Amino acid sequence: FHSFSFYELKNVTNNFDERPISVGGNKMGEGGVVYKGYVNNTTVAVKKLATTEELKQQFDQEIKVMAKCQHENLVELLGFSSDLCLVYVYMPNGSLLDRLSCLDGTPPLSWHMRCKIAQGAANGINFLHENHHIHRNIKSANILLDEAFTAKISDFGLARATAYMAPEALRGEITPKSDIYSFGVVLLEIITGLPAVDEHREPQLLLDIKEEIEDEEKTIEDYIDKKMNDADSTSVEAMYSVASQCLHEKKNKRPDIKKVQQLLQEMT
Amino acid sequence: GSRFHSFSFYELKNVTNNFDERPISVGGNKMGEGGFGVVYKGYVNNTTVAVKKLATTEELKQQFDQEIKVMAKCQHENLVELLGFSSDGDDLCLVYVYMPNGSLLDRLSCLDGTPPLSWHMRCKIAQGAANGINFLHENHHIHRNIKSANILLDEAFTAKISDFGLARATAYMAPEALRGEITPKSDIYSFGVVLLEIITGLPAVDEHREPQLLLDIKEEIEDEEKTIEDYIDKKMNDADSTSVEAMYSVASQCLHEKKNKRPDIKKVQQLLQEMT
Ligand SMILES: COc1cc(N2CCOCC2)ccc1NC(=O)c1cnc(-c2cccnc2)s1
Ligand SMILES: COc1cc(N2CCOCC2)ccc1NC(=O)c1cnc(-c2cccnc2)s1
Numbered sequence: 001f002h003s004f005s006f007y008e009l010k011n012v013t014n015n016f017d018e019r020p021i022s023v024g025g026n027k028m029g030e031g032g033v034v035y036k037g038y039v040n041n042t043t044v045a046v047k048k049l050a051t052t053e054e055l056k057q058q059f060d061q062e063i064k065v066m067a068k069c070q071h072e073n074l075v076e077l078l079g080f081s082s083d084l085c086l087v088y089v090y091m092p093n094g095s096l097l098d099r100l101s102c103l104d105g106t107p108p109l110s111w112h113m114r115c116k117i118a119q120g121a122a123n124g125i126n127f128l129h130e131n132h133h134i135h136r137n138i139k140s141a142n143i144l145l146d147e148a149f150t151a152k153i154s155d156f157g158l159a160r161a162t163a164y165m166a167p168e169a170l171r172g173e174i175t176p177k178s179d180i181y182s183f184g185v186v187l188l189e190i191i192t193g194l195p196a197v198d199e200h201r202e203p204q205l206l207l208d209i210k211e212e213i214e215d216e217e218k219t220i221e222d223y224i225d226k227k228m229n230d231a232d233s234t235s236v237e238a239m240y241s242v243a244s245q246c247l248h249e250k251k252n253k254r255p256d257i258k259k260v261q262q263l264l265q266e267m268t
Numbered sequence: 269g270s271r272f273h274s275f276s277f278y279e280l281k282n283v284t285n286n287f288d289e290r291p292i293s294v295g296g297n298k299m300g301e302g303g304f305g306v307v308y309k310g311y312v313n314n315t316t317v318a319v320k321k322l323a324t325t326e327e328l329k330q331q332f333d334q335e336i337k338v339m340a341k342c343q344h345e346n347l348v349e350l351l352g353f354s355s356d357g358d359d360l361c362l363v364y365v366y367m368p369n370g371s372l373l374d375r376l377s378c379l380d381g382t383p384p385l386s387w388h389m390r391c392k393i394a395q396g397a398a399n400g401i402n403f404l405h406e407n408h409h410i411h412r413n414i415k416s417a418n419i420l421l422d423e424a425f426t427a428k429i430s431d432f433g434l435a436r437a438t439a440y441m442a443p444e445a446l447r448g449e450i451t452p453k454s455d456i457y458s459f460g461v462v463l464l465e466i467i468t469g470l471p472a473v474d475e476h477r478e479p480q481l482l483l484d485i486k487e488e489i490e491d492e493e494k495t496i497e498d499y500i501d502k503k504m505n506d507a508d509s510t511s512v513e514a515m516y517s518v519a520s521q522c523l524h525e526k527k528n529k530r531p532d533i534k535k536v537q538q539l540l541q542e543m544t
């Protein structure tokens with residue numbers, strides 16, 4: 001790793017300027033707050049956390065996993081700082097969530113680009129499960145996009161050996177099959193371009209459109225992101241089938257990640 | 269809480285042998301425990317009563333207040349009656365009418381070698397409990413802690429609900445409840461688990477069982493990997509296959525993952541009636 005001074009990280013983020021980028025500040029996202037930092041002629045992403053021992057276990061746990069798991073579809077952790085700070089490679093196209101809601105006037109992702117992203121995301125989850133890690137916080141905000149819109153998973157604070165959470169996950173069980181479920185919600189966001197939860201929407205939870213469509217109260221067509229041109233019905237119907245399976249209430253009925261990989265590959 | 273009596277903490281302490289924590293069975297005063305306290309055997313006016321001594325602190329007082337608030341509104345054949353309360357002393361206490369046959373959980377687990385409940389009594393108890401829940405929902409309340417431990421049994425094995433501390437106007441909780449939604453369809457879900465307890469005589473959770481949650485046998489049975497008859501409580505001799513399957517059918521409907529696909533309480537009552 002690299003070691004970073006809290007002093008140094010403070011200066012390269014303009015003293016952790018919490019104003020948004022779109023104002024001339026340094027904040028890129030929050031959930032922890034992620035800042036844009038400038039080191040020499042390179043750009044980095046600095047997450048600064050905000051019980052406190054819970055924060056500490058998460059801080060620690062993220063570093064433990066990052067040390068072991070390195071992969072093309074995982075965000076690289078350059079370094080650390082001990083407030084607690086984590087330093088990552090900057091991902092120029094930001095989060096899946098940002099691009100899906102077309103933040104900052106970026107053009108909508110194409111269907112072609114969304115399938116590649118679904119596939120890269122699944123590849124990253126597979127690497128984790130292959131090495132007996134469970135992510136526990138898979139979501140649109142935690143999938144990041146490099147210069148080529150390659151998907152990379154991040155935010156391992158909760159990794160171990162609401163809108164996104166499986167029933168058993170909510171019951172407190174720890175299973176890689178909960179990652180699968182969460183990934184299902186991500187796939188619905190990818191298809192619809194809608195947020196996983198919307199207090200003013202019906203239904204409030206995106207995962208619930210699965211029931212609407214099963215009851216024939218809606219159709220997939222009713223929900224497809226109207227902002228893309230290249231979405232053929234077949235492949236969209238195929239990604240949905242994947243999401244539907246992933247969202248099964250019983251963990252045992254959900255496909256494992258390798259099977260999800262195969263299905264997403266057959267899709268294209 | 270003007271409909272109730274205010275009791276001195278000292279007098280409750282006196283009549284529970286100073287809240288003697290050893291079990292009734294060895295001459296102590298503890299009858300049960302769990303939800304925010306311990307329930308002791310006590311007396312008022314030479315009559316046996318149940319005394320719950322509550323055990324943060326401001327959440328506790330609010331649950332204390334909430335239960336008194338709710339008992340003041342809700343009186344019914346299938347709800348436990350509150351006699352009074354104590355808050356003057358070192359701990360908050362709630363004093364209830366004594367329920368001689370204890371909790372449904374005690375009786376299903378055959379606590380202290382007591383005989384198994386017959387199938388006909390399990391049916392009376394399932395109907396009584398549903399009737400208590402109907403009364404709550406009719407009066408626009410949500411119980412939020414329906415479980416076999418909170419269904420008590422009088423001399424006639426008449427089912428009476430209690431523990432209203434969480435009432436609003438993990439092994440038991442529906443998916444949407446775990447997400448912090450508050451809806452009466454969640455009580456239905458919990459009641460579904462209770463119905464499985466009644467059919468199987470198994471605890472809602474067993475850390476050492478497969479599956480660990482009784483909820484999960486539903487998936488096992490639908491797969492035909494196991495049958496109802498595999499799980500039926502083998503200690504009753506009067507359980508006929510038709511009505512057992514009918515009760516299981518009701519439980520299975522209550523345990524639908526989606527709340528809008530569950531029967532409301534009146535439908536549950538009808539289905540239970542059509543069983544008997
Ligand atoms: C919101 O995130 C970003 C936004 C942008 N945009 C781009 C367009 O202009 C406005 C901001 C750029 C980059 C990023 N992020 C990164 O570079 C990250 C690297 N690792 C990270 C992480 C995130 C969460 C939890 N754990 C780790 S984020
Ligand atoms: C476990 O409870 C009992 C056990 C027994 N047995 C009998 C046989 O020997 C051993 C103990 C008797 C009675 C009771 N209970 C009552 O009488 C109750 C009246 N209100 C109640 C309550 C319970 C919870 C939360 N809130 C209220 S308890």
